[PDB]
PDB file of C-alpha atoms in Angstrom:
ATOM      1  CA  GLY A   1       0.000   0.000   0.000  1.00 23.06           C
ATOM      2  CA  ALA A   2       2.937   2.293   0.721  1.00 24.44           C
ATOM      3  CA  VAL A   3       4.206   1.752  -2.831  1.00 26.39           C
ATOM      4  CA  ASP A   4       0.830   2.657  -4.388  1.00 25.58           C
ATOM      5  CA  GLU A   5       0.702   5.811  -2.292  1.00 25.32           C
ATOM      6  CA  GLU A   6       4.242   6.729  -3.329  1.00 23.07           C
ATOM      7  CA  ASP A   7       3.299   6.031  -6.956  1.00 21.09           C
ATOM      8  CA  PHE A   8       0.499   8.629  -6.756  1.00 21.36           C
ATOM      9  CA  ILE A   9       2.821  11.187  -5.181  1.00 21.34           C
ATOM     10  CA  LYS A  10       5.440  10.688  -7.932  1.00 22.89           C
ATOM     11  CA  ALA A  11       2.720  11.200 -10.532  1.00 21.55           C
ATOM     12  CA  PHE A  12       1.617  14.552  -8.995  1.00 18.80           C
ATOM     13  CA  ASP A  13       3.960  16.739 -11.041  1.00 21.11           C
ATOM     14  CA  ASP A  14       4.369  14.417 -14.036  1.00 17.26           C
ATOM     15  CA  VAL A  15       2.169  16.760 -16.065  1.00 17.39           C
ATOM     16  CA  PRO A  16       2.774  19.627 -18.522  1.00 18.76           C
ATOM     17  CA  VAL A  17       3.950  23.042 -17.356  1.00 19.76           C
ATOM     18  CA  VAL A  18       1.188  25.584 -17.999  1.00 23.92           C
ATOM     19  CA  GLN A  19       0.879  29.374 -17.872  1.00 20.09           C
ATOM     20  CA  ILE A  20      -1.821  31.399 -16.132  1.00 17.95           C
ATOM     21  CA  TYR A  21      -2.089  34.665 -18.055  1.00 19.79           C
ATOM     22  CA  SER A  22      -4.705  36.292 -15.788  1.00 19.73           C
ATOM     23  CA  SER A  23      -7.517  35.637 -13.325  1.00 22.50           C
ATOM     24  CA  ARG A  24      -9.828  35.456 -16.332  1.00 20.05           C
ATOM     25  CA  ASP A  25      -7.507  32.985 -18.071  1.00 20.97           C
ATOM     26  CA  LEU A  26      -7.538  30.679 -15.017  1.00 21.08           C
ATOM     27  CA  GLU A  27     -11.346  30.739 -14.830  1.00 22.81           C
ATOM     28  CA  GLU A  28     -11.654  29.947 -18.524  1.00 22.55           C
ATOM     29  CA  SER A  29      -9.138  27.096 -18.202  1.00 24.62           C
ATOM     30  CA  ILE A  30     -11.165  25.542 -15.403  1.00 24.65           C
ATOM     31  CA  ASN A  31     -14.349  26.123 -17.448  1.00 23.55           C
ATOM     32  CA  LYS A  32     -12.836  24.132 -20.308  1.00 24.21           C
ATOM     33  CA  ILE A  33     -11.767  21.317 -17.991  1.00 15.93           C
ATOM     34  CA  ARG A  34     -15.331  21.205 -16.601  1.00 14.46           C
ATOM     35  CA  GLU A  35     -16.776  20.946 -20.101  1.00 13.34           C
ATOM     36  CA  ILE A  36     -14.431  18.109 -21.057  1.00 14.61           C
ATOM     37  CA  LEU A  37     -14.978  16.123 -17.843  1.00 15.32           C
ATOM     38  CA  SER A  38     -18.757  16.680 -17.709  1.00 14.85           C
ATOM     39  CA  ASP A  39     -19.466  14.869 -20.969  1.00  9.40           C
ATOM     40  CA  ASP A  40     -20.058  11.129 -20.607  1.00  6.50           C
ATOM     41  CA  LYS A  41     -19.035  10.555 -24.247  1.00  6.39           C
ATOM     42  CA  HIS A  42     -16.003  12.857 -24.399  1.00  9.97           C
ATOM     43  CA  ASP A  43     -12.716  11.250 -25.541  1.00  9.15           C
ATOM     44  CA  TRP A  44     -11.173   9.372 -22.595  1.00  8.01           C
ATOM     45  CA  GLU A  45      -7.567  10.392 -23.318  1.00 10.36           C
ATOM     46  CA  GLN A  46      -8.673  14.011 -23.404  1.00  8.88           C
ATOM     47  CA  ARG A  47     -10.340  13.479 -20.021  1.00  7.17           C
ATOM     48  CA  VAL A  48      -7.095  12.099 -18.583  1.00 10.55           C
ATOM     49  CA  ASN A  49      -5.253  15.176 -19.841  1.00  8.26           C
ATOM     50  CA  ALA A  50      -7.906  17.501 -18.444  1.00  6.79           C
ATOM     51  CA  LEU A  51      -7.479  15.827 -15.038  1.00  3.74           C
ATOM     52  CA  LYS A  52      -3.720  16.249 -15.389  1.00  2.00           C
ATOM     53  CA  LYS A  53      -4.120  19.933 -16.312  1.00  2.00           C
ATOM     54  CA  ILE A  54      -5.771  20.529 -12.950  1.00  2.00           C
ATOM     55  CA  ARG A  55      -2.452  19.402 -11.436  1.00  2.00           C
ATOM     56  CA  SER A  56      -0.593  21.619 -13.930  1.00  2.00           C
ATOM     57  CA  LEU A  57      -2.612  24.603 -12.733  1.00  2.00           C
ATOM     58  CA  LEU A  58      -1.890  23.870  -9.063  1.00  5.57           C
ATOM     59  CA  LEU A  59       1.809  23.756  -9.878  1.00  6.14           C
ATOM     60  CA  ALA A  60       1.485  27.114 -11.668  1.00  6.64           C
ATOM     61  CA  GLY A  61       0.125  28.667  -8.475  1.00  2.83           C
ATOM     62  CA  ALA A  62      -3.619  28.589  -9.208  1.00  2.10           C
ATOM     63  CA  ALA A  63      -4.499  28.154  -5.539  1.00  5.16           C
ATOM     64  CA  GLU A  64      -3.321  31.737  -4.925  1.00  6.59           C
ATOM     65  CA  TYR A  65      -5.980  33.409  -7.088  1.00  2.00           C
ATOM     66  CA  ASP A  66      -8.927  35.214  -5.441  1.00  2.00           C
ATOM     67  CA  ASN A  67     -11.617  33.033  -7.010  1.00  2.00           C
ATOM     68  CA  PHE A  68      -9.780  29.702  -7.026  1.00  2.00           C
ATOM     69  CA  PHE A  69     -11.992  27.916  -4.522  1.00  2.00           C
ATOM     70  CA  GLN A  70     -15.066  29.120  -6.395  1.00  2.00           C
ATOM     71  CA  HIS A  71     -13.578  27.545  -9.521  1.00  2.00           C
ATOM     72  CA  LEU A  72     -12.792  24.315  -7.657  1.00  2.00           C
ATOM     73  CA  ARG A  73     -16.381  23.984  -6.397  1.00  2.00           C
ATOM     74  CA  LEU A  74     -17.427  24.009 -10.034  1.00  2.00           C
ATOM     75  CA  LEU A  75     -15.531  20.771 -10.610  1.00  2.00           C
ATOM     76  CA  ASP A  76     -17.637  18.818  -8.054  1.00  2.00           C
ATOM     77  CA  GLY A  77     -19.617  17.082 -10.786  1.00  2.00           C
ATOM     78  CA  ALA A  78     -16.519  16.528 -12.932  1.00  2.00           C
ATOM     79  CA  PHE A  79     -14.712  14.674 -10.151  1.00  2.75           C
ATOM     80  CA  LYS A  80     -17.729  12.497  -9.361  1.00  2.58           C
ATOM     81  CA  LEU A  81     -18.195  11.620 -13.026  1.00  2.29           C
ATOM     82  CA  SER A  82     -14.496  10.865 -13.504  1.00  2.00           C
ATOM     83  CA  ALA A  83     -14.274   8.659 -10.396  1.00  2.00           C
ATOM     84  CA  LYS A  84     -17.248   6.666 -11.696  1.00  2.00           C
ATOM     85  CA  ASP A  85     -15.865   6.144 -15.207  1.00  2.00           C
ATOM     86  CA  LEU A  86     -15.883   2.705 -16.847  1.00  2.00           C
ATOM     87  CA  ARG A  87     -12.217   3.226 -17.756  1.00  2.00           C
ATOM     88  CA  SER A  88      -9.688   2.745 -14.943  1.00  2.00           C
ATOM     89  CA  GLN A  89      -7.336   5.179 -16.723  1.00  2.00           C
ATOM     90  CA  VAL A  90      -9.821   7.967 -16.025  1.00  2.00           C
ATOM     91  CA  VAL A  91     -10.648   6.757 -12.514  1.00  2.00           C
ATOM     92  CA  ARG A  92      -6.993   6.475 -11.580  1.00  2.00           C
ATOM     93  CA  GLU A  93      -6.075   9.903 -12.942  1.00  2.00           C
ATOM     94  CA  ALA A  94      -8.960  11.426 -11.009  1.00  2.00           C
ATOM     95  CA  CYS A  95      -7.775   9.798  -7.780  1.00  2.00           C
ATOM     96  CA  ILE A  96      -4.232  11.051  -8.381  1.00  2.00           C
ATOM     97  CA  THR A  97      -5.493  14.605  -8.949  1.00  2.00           C
ATOM     98  CA  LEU A  98      -7.694  14.381  -5.831  1.00  2.00           C
ATOM     99  CA  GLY A  99      -4.625  13.302  -3.836  1.00  2.00           C
ATOM    100  CA  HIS A 100      -2.675  16.224  -5.306  1.00  2.00           C
ATOM    101  CA  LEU A 101      -5.415  18.707  -4.406  1.00  2.00           C
ATOM    102  CA  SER A 102      -5.376  17.424  -0.834  1.00  2.00           C
ATOM    103  CA  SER A 103      -1.592  17.625  -0.538  1.00  2.00           C
ATOM    104  CA  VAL A 104      -1.456  21.129  -2.022  1.00  2.00           C
ATOM    105  CA  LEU A 105      -4.485  22.690  -0.276  1.00  2.00           C
ATOM    106  CA  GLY A 106      -4.399  20.741   2.996  1.00  2.00           C
ATOM    107  CA  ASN A 107      -7.278  21.854   5.206  1.00  2.00           C
ATOM    108  CA  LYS A 108      -8.575  24.185   2.473  1.00  2.00           C
ATOM    109  CA  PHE A 109      -9.650  21.118   0.480  1.00  2.00           C
ATOM    110  CA  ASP A 110     -12.380  20.767   3.118  1.00  2.00           C
ATOM    111  CA  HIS A 111     -15.332  21.244   0.742  1.00  2.00           C
ATOM    112  CA  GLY A 112     -13.914  19.193  -2.125  1.00  2.00           C
ATOM    113  CA  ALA A 113     -12.845  16.280   0.070  1.00  2.00           C
ATOM    114  CA  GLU A 114     -16.251  15.977   1.743  1.00  2.00           C
ATOM    115  CA  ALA A 115     -18.024  16.251  -1.612  1.00  2.00           C
ATOM    116  CA  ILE A 116     -16.033  13.488  -3.331  1.00  2.00           C
ATOM    117  CA  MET A 117     -15.380  11.083  -0.434  1.00  2.00           C
ATOM    118  CA  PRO A 118     -18.538   8.951  -0.760  1.00  2.00           C
ATOM    119  CA  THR A 119     -17.815   8.504  -4.471  1.00  2.00           C
ATOM    120  CA  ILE A 120     -14.299   7.223  -3.864  1.00  2.00           C
ATOM    121  CA  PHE A 121     -15.528   4.982  -1.039  1.00  2.00           C
ATOM    122  CA  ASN A 122     -17.712   3.376  -3.707  1.00  2.00           C
ATOM    123  CA  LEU A 123     -14.494   2.205  -5.403  1.00  2.00           C
ATOM    124  CA  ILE A 124     -13.369   0.234  -2.337  1.00  2.00           C
ATOM    125  CA  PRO A 125     -15.497  -2.889  -2.936  1.00  2.00           C
ATOM    126  CA  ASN A 126     -14.761  -3.030  -6.701  1.00  2.00           C
ATOM    127  CA  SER A 127     -13.409  -6.480  -7.504  1.00  2.00           C
ATOM    128  CA  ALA A 128     -10.978  -4.922 -10.005  1.00  2.00           C
ATOM    129  CA  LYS A 129      -7.688  -4.310  -8.164  1.00  2.00           C
ATOM    130  CA  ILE A 130      -6.771  -1.122 -10.016  1.00  2.00           C
ATOM    131  CA  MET A 131     -10.206   0.383  -9.293  1.00  2.00           C
ATOM    132  CA  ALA A 132     -10.207  -0.508  -5.584  1.00  2.00           C
ATOM    133  CA  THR A 133      -6.587   0.545  -4.978  1.00  2.00           C
ATOM    134  CA  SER A 134      -7.002   3.943  -6.693  1.00  2.00           C
ATOM    135  CA  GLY A 135      -9.850   4.743  -4.331  1.00  2.00           C
ATOM    136  CA  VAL A 136      -7.991   3.443  -1.290  1.00  2.00           C
ATOM    137  CA  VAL A 137      -4.921   5.566  -2.028  1.00  2.00           C
ATOM    138  CA  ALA A 138      -6.975   8.725  -2.690  1.00  2.00           C
ATOM    139  CA  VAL A 139      -8.721   8.329   0.688  1.00  2.00           C
ATOM    140  CA  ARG A 140      -5.418   7.785   2.503  1.00  2.00           C
ATOM    141  CA  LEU A 141      -3.866  10.869   0.889  1.00  2.00           C
ATOM    142  CA  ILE A 142      -6.881  12.977   1.824  1.00  2.00           C
ATOM    143  CA  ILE A 143      -6.806  11.765   5.449  1.00  2.00           C
ATOM    144  CA  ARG A 144      -3.071  12.516   5.552  1.00  2.00           C
ATOM    145  CA  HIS A 145      -3.349  16.122   4.345  1.00  2.00           C
ATOM    146  CA  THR A 146      -6.888  17.401   4.940  1.00  2.00           C
ATOM    147  CA  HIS A 147      -7.550  17.299   8.690  1.00  2.00           C
ATOM    148  CA  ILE A 148     -11.200  18.303   8.634  1.00  2.00           C
ATOM    149  CA  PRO A 149     -13.517  17.071  11.408  1.00  2.00           C
ATOM    150  CA  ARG A 150     -16.506  16.872   9.060  1.00  2.00           C
ATOM    151  CA  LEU A 151     -14.757  14.018   7.263  1.00  2.00           C
ATOM    152  CA  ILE A 152     -14.903  11.800  10.361  1.00  2.00           C
ATOM    153  CA  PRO A 153     -18.602  10.801  10.099  1.00  2.00           C
ATOM    154  CA  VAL A 154     -18.216  10.091   6.382  1.00  2.00           C
ATOM    155  CA  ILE A 155     -15.412   7.647   7.204  1.00  2.00           C
ATOM    156  CA  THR A 156     -16.960   6.037  10.307  1.00  2.00           C
ATOM    157  CA  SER A 157     -20.345   5.505   8.640  1.00  2.00           C
ATOM    158  CA  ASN A 158     -18.806   2.968   6.364  1.00  2.00           C
ATOM    159  CA  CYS A 159     -17.698   0.940   9.393  1.00  2.00           C
ATOM    160  CA  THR A 160     -20.905  -0.868   9.252  1.00  2.00           C
ATOM    161  CA  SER A 161     -21.032  -1.763   5.548  1.00  2.00           C
ATOM    162  CA  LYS A 162     -22.315  -5.150   4.390  1.00  2.00           C
ATOM    163  CA  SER A 163     -19.169  -5.157   2.241  1.00  2.00           C
ATOM    164  CA  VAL A 164     -16.436  -6.663   4.432  1.00  2.00           C
ATOM    165  CA  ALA A 165     -13.815  -4.988   2.242  1.00  2.00           C
ATOM    166  CA  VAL A 166     -15.322  -1.569   2.978  1.00  2.00           C
ATOM    167  CA  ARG A 167     -15.326  -2.421   6.724  1.00  2.00           C
ATOM    168  CA  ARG A 168     -11.665  -3.497   6.742  1.00  2.00           C
ATOM    169  CA  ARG A 169     -10.549  -0.406   4.807  1.00  2.00           C
ATOM    170  CA  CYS A 170     -12.699   1.784   7.053  1.00  2.00           C
ATOM    171  CA  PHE A 171     -10.849   0.734  10.149  1.00  2.00           C
ATOM    172  CA  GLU A 172      -7.535   1.008   8.262  1.00  2.00           C
ATOM    173  CA  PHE A 173      -8.542   4.585   7.369  1.00  2.00           C
ATOM    174  CA  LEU A 174      -9.632   5.262  10.954  1.00  2.00           C
ATOM    175  CA  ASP A 175      -6.346   3.901  12.302  1.00  2.00           C
ATOM    176  CA  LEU A 176      -4.444   6.221   9.964  1.00  2.00           C
ATOM    177  CA  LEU A 177      -6.619   9.209  10.914  1.00  2.00           C
ATOM    178  CA  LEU A 178      -6.097   8.661  14.653  1.00  2.00           C
ATOM    179  CA  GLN A 179      -2.351   8.395  14.082  1.00  2.00           C
ATOM    180  CA  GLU A 180      -2.116  11.441  11.807  1.00  2.00           C
ATOM    181  CA  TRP A 181      -4.586  13.963  13.253  1.00  2.00           C
ATOM    182  CA  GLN A 182      -4.010  16.088  16.359  1.00  2.00           C
ATOM    183  CA  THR A 183      -6.304  15.682  19.365  1.00  2.00           C
ATOM    184  CA  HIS A 184      -8.054  19.017  18.775  1.00  2.00           C
ATOM    185  CA  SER A 185      -9.195  17.780  15.327  1.00  2.00           C
ATOM    186  CA  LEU A 186     -11.016  14.896  17.039  1.00  2.00           C
ATOM    187  CA  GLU A 187     -12.653  16.597  20.022  1.00  2.00           C
ATOM    188  CA  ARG A 188     -16.037  17.246  18.430  1.00  2.00           C
ATOM    189  CA  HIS A 189     -16.332  13.569  17.485  1.00  2.00           C
ATOM    190  CA  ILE A 190     -15.286  11.611  20.589  1.00  2.00           C
ATOM    191  CA  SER A 191     -18.573   9.690  20.938  1.00  2.00           C
ATOM    192  CA  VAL A 192     -18.901   8.614  17.307  1.00  2.00           C
ATOM    193  CA  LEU A 193     -15.265   7.464  17.339  1.00  2.00           C
ATOM    194  CA  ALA A 194     -15.833   5.407  20.499  1.00  2.00           C
ATOM    195  CA  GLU A 195     -19.043   3.780  19.198  1.00  2.00           C
ATOM    196  CA  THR A 196     -17.469   3.052  15.813  1.00  2.00           C
ATOM    197  CA  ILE A 197     -14.464   1.411  17.451  1.00  2.00           C
ATOM    198  CA  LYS A 198     -16.795  -0.515  19.769  1.00  2.00           C
ATOM    199  CA  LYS A 199     -18.640  -1.969  16.771  1.00  2.00           C
ATOM    200  CA  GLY A 200     -15.349  -2.904  15.115  1.00  2.00           C
ATOM    201  CA  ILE A 201     -14.125  -4.737  18.196  1.00  2.00           C
ATOM    202  CA  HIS A 202     -17.254  -6.928  17.926  1.00  2.00           C
ATOM    203  CA  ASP A 203     -16.988  -7.302  14.137  1.00  2.00           C
ATOM    204  CA  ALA A 204     -17.639 -10.732  12.625  1.00  2.00           C
ATOM    205  CA  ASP A 205     -14.544 -10.366  10.462  1.00  2.00           C
ATOM    206  CA  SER A 206     -11.132 -11.217  11.912  1.00  2.00           C
ATOM    207  CA  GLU A 207      -9.106  -8.692   9.888  1.00  2.00           C
ATOM    208  CA  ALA A 208     -11.625  -5.967  10.710  1.00  2.00           C
ATOM    209  CA  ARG A 209     -11.292  -6.729  14.445  1.00  2.00           C
ATOM    210  CA  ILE A 210      -7.493  -6.435  14.260  1.00  2.00           C
ATOM    211  CA  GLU A 211      -7.732  -2.993  12.646  1.00  2.00           C
ATOM    212  CA  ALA A 212     -10.393  -1.936  15.140  1.00  2.00           C
ATOM    213  CA  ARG A 213      -8.050  -2.799  18.001  1.00  2.00           C
ATOM    214  CA  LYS A 214      -5.389  -0.577  16.414  1.00  2.00           C
ATOM    215  CA  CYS A 215      -8.050   2.142  16.346  1.00  2.00           C
ATOM    216  CA  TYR A 216      -8.829   1.534  20.005  1.00  2.00           C
ATOM    217  CA  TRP A 217      -5.280   2.272  21.121  1.00  2.00           C
ATOM    218  CA  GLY A 218      -4.993   5.237  18.766  1.00  2.00           C
ATOM    219  CA  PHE A 219      -8.202   6.574  20.294  1.00  2.00           C
ATOM    220  CA  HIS A 220      -6.911   5.780  23.795  1.00  2.00           C
ATOM    221  CA  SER A 221      -3.774   7.856  23.230  1.00  2.00           C
ATOM    222  CA  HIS A 222      -5.982  10.889  22.503  1.00  2.00           C
ATOM    223  CA  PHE A 223      -8.756  10.276  25.042  1.00  2.00           C
ATOM    224  CA  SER A 224      -7.698   7.899  27.793  1.00  2.00           C
ATOM    225  CA  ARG A 225     -10.694   8.682  30.029  1.00  2.00           C
ATOM    226  CA  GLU A 226     -13.285   7.880  27.358  1.00  2.00           C
ATOM    227  CA  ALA A 227     -11.330   4.847  26.084  1.00  2.00           C
ATOM    228  CA  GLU A 228     -11.067   3.362  29.582  1.00  2.00           C
ATOM    229  CA  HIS A 229     -14.846   3.806  29.963  1.00  2.00           C
ATOM    230  CA  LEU A 230     -15.403   2.002  26.656  1.00  2.00           C
ATOM    231  CA  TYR A 231     -13.003  -0.741  27.797  1.00  2.00           C
ATOM    232  CA  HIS A 232     -15.049  -1.465  30.910  1.00  2.00           C
ATOM    233  CA  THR A 233     -18.296  -1.859  28.964  1.00  2.00           C
ATOM    234  CA  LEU A 234     -16.728  -4.788  27.113  1.00  2.00           C
ATOM    235  CA  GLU A 235     -17.199  -8.450  27.961  1.00  2.00           C
ATOM    236  CA  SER A 236     -14.091 -10.152  29.321  1.00  2.00           C
ATOM    237  CA  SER A 237     -13.049 -11.871  26.076  1.00  2.00           C
ATOM    238  CA  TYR A 238     -12.875  -8.594  24.126  1.00  2.00           C
ATOM    239  CA  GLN A 239     -10.929  -6.885  26.912  1.00  2.00           C
ATOM    240  CA  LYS A 240      -8.265  -9.594  26.777  1.00  2.00           C
ATOM    241  CA  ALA A 241      -8.067  -9.389  22.978  1.00  2.00           C
ATOM    242  CA  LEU A 242      -7.409  -5.648  23.347  1.00  2.00           C
ATOM    243  CA  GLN A 243      -4.600  -6.335  25.817  1.00  2.00           C
ATOM    244  CA  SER A 244      -2.835  -8.558  23.257  1.00  2.00           C
TER     245      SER A 244
END
């Protein structure tokens, strides 16, 4: 998984150098990208290049312009469409560009991350490895760089999926989030974290339980009081499993 993540990161700037000739020029460039990515029947190679050009623009300093985040909102539909494409080339490029947006904007990717996250979670159970992995890596990159509390319920809600794959990944994501985010980023969501981890500890799946226990101790390190309380509501067998 570390190699796939590194592969995305290396791809971030493997895109053409572009110029931004004005605020108007930037808006029109993003308008053109929206047009290309919003058409179901538009040439797939041209869609890959349009997704790459978003990275080009970031590298040209687009994020500095007054209206940039207005422009980025406009691409909500484009990202969803791209991440749902039949062609993994398009899906994968979209996930790379989403990861790049997160790494460049950090916490200012708050709106875009929340808007696209359910769509990329829908990749997780795909039986095609390239499809699933692209979505997994995009989520991990977003969690790593965009520490936004509103993302926590989106992630935890998938803890309870009928798809075992989604459940396993969910607790992998949660483990990563607890390890990467500061305590203050978690304080509005203590209860939902505790209940989500509680459900994972009792999960029917063995791999899911193992990840949930990682989550428990991550959670404990932030909130020992609340984690100890959760611990003592557990039957004896689960308490011993946690101590292992």
